[PDB]
Design a protein around this motif. Sequence first.
Motif, PDB file in Angstrom:
ATOM      1  N   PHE A   8     -42.950   2.336  41.584  1.00  0.00           N
ATOM      2  CA  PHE A   8     -42.361   3.187  41.069  1.00  0.00           C
ATOM      3  C   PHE A   8     -41.643   3.556  39.596  1.00  0.00           C
ATOM      4  CE2 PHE A   8     -43.366   5.041  45.435  1.00  0.00           C
ATOM      5  CZ  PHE A   8     -44.557   5.785  44.848  1.00  0.00           C
ATOM      6  N   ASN A   9     -41.833   4.498  38.335  1.00  0.00           N
ATOM      7  CA  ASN A   9     -41.531   4.456  36.857  1.00  0.00           C
ATOM      8  C   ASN A   9     -39.518   5.823  37.354  1.00  0.00           C
ATOM      9  OD1 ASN A   9     -42.910   2.119  36.598  1.00  0.00           O
ATOM     10  ND2 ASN A   9     -43.540   4.157  34.722  1.00  0.00           N
ATOM     11  N   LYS A  10     -38.956   4.524  37.523  1.00  0.00           N
ATOM     12  CA  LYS A  10     -37.222   5.509  37.277  1.00  0.00           C
ATOM     13  C   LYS A  10     -36.815   6.697  35.792  1.00  0.00           C
ATOM     14  CE  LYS A  10     -34.442   2.550  37.902  1.00  0.00           C
ATOM     15  NZ  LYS A  10     -33.165   0.979  38.832  1.00  0.00           N
ATOM     16  N   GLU A  11     -37.599   6.660  35.846  1.00  0.00           N
ATOM     17  CA  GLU A  11     -36.511   7.519  34.098  1.00  0.00           C
ATOM     18  C   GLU A  11     -35.027   8.466  33.937  1.00  0.00           C
ATOM     19  OE1 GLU A  11     -39.281  11.016  34.625  1.00  0.00           O
ATOM     20  OE2 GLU A  11     -40.975   9.702  34.287  1.00  0.00           O
ATOM     21  N   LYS A  12     -34.594   8.535  33.528  1.00  0.00           N
ATOM     22  CA  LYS A  12     -32.546   8.772  33.068  1.00  0.00           C
ATOM     23  C   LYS A  12     -32.466  10.692  32.708  1.00  0.00           C
ATOM     24  CE  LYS A  12     -30.185   5.298  32.220  1.00  0.00           C
ATOM     25  NZ  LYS A  12     -30.225   4.555  31.140  1.00  0.00           N
ATOM     26  N   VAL A  13     -31.042  11.142  34.215  1.00  0.00           N
ATOM     27  CA  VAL A  13     -31.748  12.361  33.159  1.00  0.00           C
ATOM     28  C   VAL A  13     -29.966  11.905  32.847  1.00  0.00           C
ATOM     29  CG1 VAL A  13     -33.295  14.101  33.898  1.00  0.00           C
ATOM     30  CG2 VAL A  13     -31.203  12.879  35.362  1.00  0.00           C
ATOM     31  N   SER A  14     -29.340  13.575  32.015  1.00  0.00           N
ATOM     32  CA  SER A  14     -27.981  13.668  31.647  1.00  0.00           C
ATOM     33  C   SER A  14     -27.546  14.396  31.704  1.00  0.00           C
ATOM     34  CB  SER A  14     -27.790  13.234  30.425  1.00  0.00           C
ATOM     35  OG  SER A  14     -26.977  12.780  30.592  1.00  0.00           O
ATOM     36  N   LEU A  15     -26.727  14.686  32.309  1.00  0.00           N
ATOM     37  CA  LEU A  15     -25.773  16.175  32.756  1.00  0.00           C
ATOM     38  C   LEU A  15     -24.790  15.845  32.989  1.00  0.00           C
ATOM     39  CD1 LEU A  15     -27.571  16.441  36.723  1.00  0.00           C
ATOM     40  CD2 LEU A  15     -28.386  17.368  34.218  1.00  0.00           C
ATOM     41  N   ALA A  16     -24.127  16.317  31.376  1.00  0.00           N
ATOM     42  CA  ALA A  16     -22.715  16.915  31.790  1.00  0.00           C
ATOM     43  C   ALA A  16     -22.082  15.607  31.244  1.00  0.00           C
ATOM     44  CB  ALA A  16     -21.702  17.986  32.769  1.00  0.00           C
ATOM     45  N   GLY A  17     -22.558  14.829  30.213  1.00  0.00           N
ATOM     46  CA  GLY A  17     -22.576  13.358  29.409  1.00  0.00           C
ATOM     47  C   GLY A  17     -22.799  12.353  30.907  1.00  0.00           C
ATOM     48  N   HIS A  18     -23.115  12.744  32.275  1.00  0.00           N
ATOM     49  CA  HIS A  18     -23.018  11.533  33.093  1.00  0.00           C
ATOM     50  C   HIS A  18     -24.701  11.449  33.611  1.00  0.00           C
ATOM     51  CE1 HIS A  18     -19.603  13.260  34.184  1.00  0.00           C
ATOM     52  NE2 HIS A  18     -19.217  12.157  34.094  1.00  0.00           N
ATOM     53  N   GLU A  19     -24.792  10.123  33.344  1.00  0.00           N
ATOM     54  CA  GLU A  19     -26.218   9.811  33.677  1.00  0.00           C
ATOM     55  C   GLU A  19     -26.655   9.860  35.184  1.00  0.00           C
ATOM     56  OE1 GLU A  19     -27.528   6.525  31.161  1.00  0.00           O
ATOM     57  OE2 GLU A  19     -27.100   7.893  29.267  1.00  0.00           O
ATOM     58  N   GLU A  20     -28.358   9.635  35.488  1.00  0.00           N
ATOM     59  CA  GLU A  20     -28.885   9.505  36.840  1.00  0.00           C
ATOM     60  C   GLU A  20     -29.664   9.340  36.522  1.00  0.00           C
ATOM     61  OE1 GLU A  20     -27.983  12.841  39.689  1.00  0.00           O
ATOM     62  OE2 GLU A  20     -26.961  13.968  38.660  1.00  0.00           O
ATOM     63  N   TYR A  21     -30.873   8.443  37.779  1.00  0.00           N
ATOM     64  CA  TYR A  21     -32.205   8.694  38.034  1.00  0.00           C
ATOM     65  C   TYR A  21     -32.795   9.040  38.732  1.00  0.00           C
ATOM     66  CZ  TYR A  21     -30.836   3.839  35.959  1.00  0.00           C
ATOM     67  OH  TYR A  21     -30.493   2.198  34.998  1.00  0.00           O
ATOM     68  N   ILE A  22     -34.188   9.593  38.517  1.00  0.00           N
ATOM     69  CA  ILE A  22     -35.199   9.745  38.734  1.00  0.00           C
ATOM     70  C   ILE A  22     -36.642   9.690  39.261  1.00  0.00           C
ATOM     71  CG2 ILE A  22     -33.891  12.847  38.476  1.00  0.00           C
ATOM     72  CD1 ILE A  22     -36.215  12.875  36.607  1.00  0.00           C
ATOM     73  N   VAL A  23     -37.266  10.456  39.722  1.00  0.00           N
ATOM     74  CA  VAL A  23     -38.676   9.321  39.767  1.00  0.00           C
ATOM     75  C   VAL A  23     -38.984  10.653  39.818  1.00  0.00           C
ATOM     76  CG1 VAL A  23     -40.327   8.263  40.882  1.00  0.00           C
ATOM     77  CG2 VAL A  23     -37.653   7.587  41.167  1.00  0.00           C
ATOM     78  N   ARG A  24     -40.250  10.935  38.812  1.00  0.00           N
ATOM     79  CA  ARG A  24     -40.637  12.097  38.506  1.00  0.00           C
ATOM     80  C   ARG A  24     -42.100  12.341  39.247  1.00  0.00           C
ATOM     81  NH1 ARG A  24     -41.688  15.212  33.444  1.00  0.00           N
ATOM     82  NH2 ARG A  24     -39.575  14.602  33.415  1.00  0.00           N
TER      83      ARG A  24
END
Lengths: 495, 490
Positions: A8-24
Amino acid sequence: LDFDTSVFNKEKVSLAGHEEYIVRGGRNLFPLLPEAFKGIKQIGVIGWGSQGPAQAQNLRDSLAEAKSDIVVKIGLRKGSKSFDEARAAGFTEESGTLGDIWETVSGSDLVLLLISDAAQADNYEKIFSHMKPNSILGLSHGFLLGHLQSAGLDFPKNISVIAVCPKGMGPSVRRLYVQGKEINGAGINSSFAVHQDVDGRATDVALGWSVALGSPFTFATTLEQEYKSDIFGERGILLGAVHGIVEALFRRYTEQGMDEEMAYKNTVEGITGIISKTISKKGMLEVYNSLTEEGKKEFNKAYSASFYPCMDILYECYEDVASGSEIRSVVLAGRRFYEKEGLPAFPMGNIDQTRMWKVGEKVRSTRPENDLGPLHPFTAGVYVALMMAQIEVLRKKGHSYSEIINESVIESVDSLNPFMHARGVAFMVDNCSTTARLGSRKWAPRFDYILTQQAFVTVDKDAPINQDLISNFMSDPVHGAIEVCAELRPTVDIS
Amino acid sequence: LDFDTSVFNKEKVSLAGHEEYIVRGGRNLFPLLPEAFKGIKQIGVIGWGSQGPAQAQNLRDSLAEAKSDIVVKIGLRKGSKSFDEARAAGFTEESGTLGDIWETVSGSDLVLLLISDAAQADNYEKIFSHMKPNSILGLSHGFLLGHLQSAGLDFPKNISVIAVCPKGMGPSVRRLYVQGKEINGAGINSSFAVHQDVDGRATDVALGWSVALGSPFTFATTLEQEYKSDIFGERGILLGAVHGIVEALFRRYTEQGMDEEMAYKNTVEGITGIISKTISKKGMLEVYNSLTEEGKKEFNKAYSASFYPCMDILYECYEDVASGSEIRSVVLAGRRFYEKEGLPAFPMGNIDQTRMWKVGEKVRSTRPENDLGPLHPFTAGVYVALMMAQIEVLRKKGHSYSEIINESVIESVDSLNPFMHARGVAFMVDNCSTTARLGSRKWAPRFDYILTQQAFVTVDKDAPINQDLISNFMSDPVHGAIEVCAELRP
Ligand SMILES: [Mg+2]
Ligand SMILES: [Mg+2]
Ligand SMILES: [Mg+2]
Ligand SMILES: [Mg+2]
Ligand SMILES: [Mg+2]
């Protein structure tokens, strides 16, 4: 928190300056499921109940769409009353898709253990004894890890252990999956964890499972964090704390002379209706901004008075969950539902017969269509203070913003509260999962007492507004993060 | 439960057909103390709260009366109120009867650890490391065992571990001891336990300690049973459950239109006054039998509806205390009194500013000398149901009748409730020692809600009386047992 997926392809999200990885997620990913599920010929779904039917039907449909030969087989305990229902849904002995729990576990490469928490605590040794070496145990909640940890035990070394944890009730997991056949982004989001990975397959199997369930997004967590967030959260704002604060507020308002029906409307109706809708649409700042200038003062009085009392109890509850104390108490509580040691059985009773729930029955029976209730500024200030205090406890206890927001804000206002607006809080306290019901019964009274002993006393003393609290609320990074996270919600209403 | 003492005579008590051994004390037995304390040259009294002053002075006096050369030495931090008080009582560095904690531990053959629960949990490794092999650790309450067990630990294998647990407040242990020099049999009863006995001296030492404290009778228990009875009991009828049921009843009565002051009188004043006094003098049956024919029906409705709800919470609480869950939660709660992990401090708050406690302040400000309050039959039914439910949980969980009766009936109506009648329930909750205060706050709301949500709903249904519950109450063997135990009171 990172993970390694070959499929799978990992996508990044940023919340309050904190990055996390998600899988759509998405149906366009279904062709990847055979690769994700390498080494898997049978998925055994153990248990019917709520999540079993939804997950089994979704997996079955997804694997068919993927042109996979993998067999989804339901495994039921001998005492189960759900055989005929399973067969009606096309899971049958004749087709190799229904069987006894033990036979089913034995034949499975991925075992989805979806029986009750109490049944997990009672059966884990036997479940482990039946599993193929190098097979995979999947959980949709981390209770069992917490139970083992409380006893100084862990899972066997010869199996992988993963979790896929939907942010929605079973019926919605199925409903939104079917809708998702037509509407892009319709499905229930999930978080996933990999607790043990014996052969390198675990991450792709977990992500495959989440995607095949129809999760529009899959967030990354750990099994320890998931169980702490869930078990604490239901004792907090999801159920326990909301019951406790509404009892405290209804008592206060009626003491002050408010008619009972109005007291109900201004507490329960407002929280589960208009307040929840407002938070869901535009967040907590909009709740405050939508008030009159007079109402803002009242909101601030409540928030300033209520934040720390709520935090006191939440902090206590969180540490008891994390330490082993609370899960042990839940396991022992379940055993007291039956006669032992020469003592009587004590199954849980109902809450629905005390003063305010009798009033609630009347209110709902005469309630106009699509009524969302009045927005009482004091009630709003207490509820928002509770929400912000729970966020802060989870933040300082090391949880990710996605988990804090997904489970402690979104799932509350979008899944549980709408359910409670329809049927009443009492319904949920009387009909939820055993662990949640025990949690609500144990902790609701704590919130009622602390608001009554401390928060209300502060207000009645005419205490000055704590501007540190109020400025912190208005400037908190979580509000921006909620906006970002709220965009990752399903594209249809989830409850 | 048997025990083997080479020094003291034991005698039997029969409670509901269950025999136990007890040890009668008295100053006339003081010539036995030298043999009881074979191998002891120094007793180190560690700490000086409510029990330290009494136990140090009582042991000093008893050993003086015995003509013993055993030294009673107080271990305290130099530079404190406690240190000043010990010096004023004649314990001094000059005479070798007051010193540093660790030096005192190191030089003691019997170490009496009288510091707080929290202090014991924080210091046990250091205490153990300073103790002489084969010396004896004496506790006056079993919290430390509960703490160790919660972590899967136990005491070191090289020390004996015993307990002597007086059934009264520290000041009374001393005051009655002093009174006992003039009035025969004045003193506070105790229970004792031997948790570890590494050299065969532990039982005689425990009994010598209890007798030298002036205990008119010493009852036999185990350290595990003592800490469960105590920690659960304070969450139950001794404190937490009384707070909970009185909040619940006050709310009910006022909802029913009773004026607030009368509601307070009919709940708090009645329980801690006339109901307690009646139970103390003539037991629970007398409470029921004292009622009018109409009142008896109200008592029975309340008892029938309340017994199981009370039991439900009592049973839960007991299991959490026994399992490690509750003691761990108490230790963690202590650490949240201060800032850590970037979170605020949460010191314990007060109960006394809510509706019923404000009413209570006003009522108490005017209540005459020695008014015991009204005996409301519905309140009596709830309170007696609670007492019987606690008795039943303890009995089924394996506790002896003397421990059940002494700690859950007698100490409650004779020591704790009179204190609460004088000072108020809110005062007792807000000023209580930490483990009990935390217990009360955590569990009081549970009793309030179970009565409100279940018991009162049952009554308001016009549910038929559960005749088996009522029959069971009237015929319960505990009533005769209480009469027998009551006769062993100071
Ligand atoms: Mg891990
Ligand atoms: Mg959850
Ligand atoms: Mg849950
Ligand atoms: Mg005690
Ligand atoms: Mg205690």
